[PDB]
Amino acid sequence: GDEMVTRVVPVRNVSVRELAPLLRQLNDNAGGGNVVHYDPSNVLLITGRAAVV
Amino acid sequence: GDEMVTRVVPVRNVSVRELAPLLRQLNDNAGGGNVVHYDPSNVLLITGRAAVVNRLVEVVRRVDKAGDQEVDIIKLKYASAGEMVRLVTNLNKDGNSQGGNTSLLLAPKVVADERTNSVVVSGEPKARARIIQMVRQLDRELQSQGNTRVFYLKYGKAKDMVEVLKGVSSLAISADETTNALVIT
Amino acid sequence: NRLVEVVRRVDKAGDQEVDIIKLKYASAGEMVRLVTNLNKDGNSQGGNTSLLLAPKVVADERTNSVVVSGEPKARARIIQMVRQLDRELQSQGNTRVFYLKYGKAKDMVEVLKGVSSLAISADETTNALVIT
């Protein structure tokens, strides 16, 4: 539920760059403590509580 | 806990430049005494108290393991690595692009060796997962009927027939004078 | 104290060393070709990426040695890739020799040359066909 952990899924098919408004918007969706960021290697790395993640 | 130490993790997969807002923001997250900075040689160097650095280095190894790009080699026993290459090369955007913000030049790519007949992958574990499937998809053998057949002619002479068929081709023919058979491909 | 801390830090923050370990089996040049298609292992013109300063891959065919230039994460994953492609052949090679029993190797070469026209020779002595 409130468990703050970092977990990482790539978007292989597409450049993950297209989820930057979306997922940092999901940081911006509810109570913070979140990180979203993007590799040109096109893996999408996350940090946050269990639900937001 | 409050132990102020410097420790350094590279992001090999990606240029570490992308954690500059994030990690100096983690300086900016709580009570200061922090340093974050970046080598173009793409190691990420930190200074700070034990916790702030716990979640900093968390970010760094994370971004590091976020974008894996390893190679897997498994032997192909059957269909040609070069045909394997050609057919899959037309799978453009399996890492083969000039995409800008996409950066698809950092995405998984496909290869093969014809000395061992080995598929070569370079990229993601999703690429390991799906290209071990594509290894298996084309590692199929021939079923009896090949590309090349040999016709045993009974009443016709193979050497004379070659000339006849050469017109039709003019496809690659020779006739074996001994067994009087025609080898066309 | 904490200035020079920053400096040695930024110094070890972007490591770039080389590692040389012998390949015993499959060709360094093939090793080169197959990995060269791993573009973005240091092989790019990327701006703020600066991937021209990221790890790159090489080989020698005189010792048959892999050469790396970059990170220890590159040492870690390219010593894996050394081992992945350093596998030997399993009995069946690229080239086979067929012993023909009722057919003559020199005569068969010309027959097969059509099929190829793939690289053939026939040994007059043991009357065998060597195709690759």
CA distance linking residue C3 with residue C115, whole number of Å: 73
A42 and B99 in contact by Cβ < 8 A? no
Same domain, B16 and B30: yes
Same domain, B77 and B132: yes
CA distance linking residue A15 with residue B67, whole number of Å: 12
**Helix spans in B28-98 (H):** 50-66, 81-89
Residues of B in contact with A27 (CB under 8 A): none
Q: How far is CA B23 from CA B30, B66, B185, C43, in A?
A: 11, 16, 64, 27
Structure resolution in Å?
Answer: 3.7
**B45 close contact with C: CB closer than 8 A:** yes
**B21 close contact with C: CB closer than 8 A:** no
Q: Which of B63, B101, B108 sits opposite A37 (nearest CB)?
A: B63
| Domain count along chain A | 1
CATH number at residue A15: 3.30.1370.120
Same domain, B50 and B71: no
Same domain, B55 and B18: yes
Distance between the two ends of chain C, CA-based, in angstroms? Answer: 66
CA distance C55 to chain B (A): 8
Q: What are phi and psi of B81, to 5 degrees?
A: -65, -35
A10 and B66 in contact by Cβ < 8 A? yes
Same domain, B89 and B136: yes
The first and second tokens of residue C91, run together, are 């009995």
Domain that holds residue B105: 67-140
Closest-CA residue of chain C to B99: C46
CA distance A37 to chain C (A): 15
Same domain, B54 and B80: no
**C14 close contact with A: CB closer than 8 A:** no
- Angle in degrees, CA A48, A52, A53, rounded to 5: 60
Closest residue by Cα to residue A47 from C60, B62, B151 = B62
Strand partners, B48: B5
CA distance linking residue C108 with residue C116, whole number of Å: 12
CA distance linking residue B30 with residue B142, whole number of Å: 66
3-state secondary structure of A16: helix
B183 and C114 in contact by Cβ < 8 A? yes
B68 and A38 in contact by Cβ < 8 A? no
Distance between the two ends of chain B, CA-based, in angstroms? Answer: 75
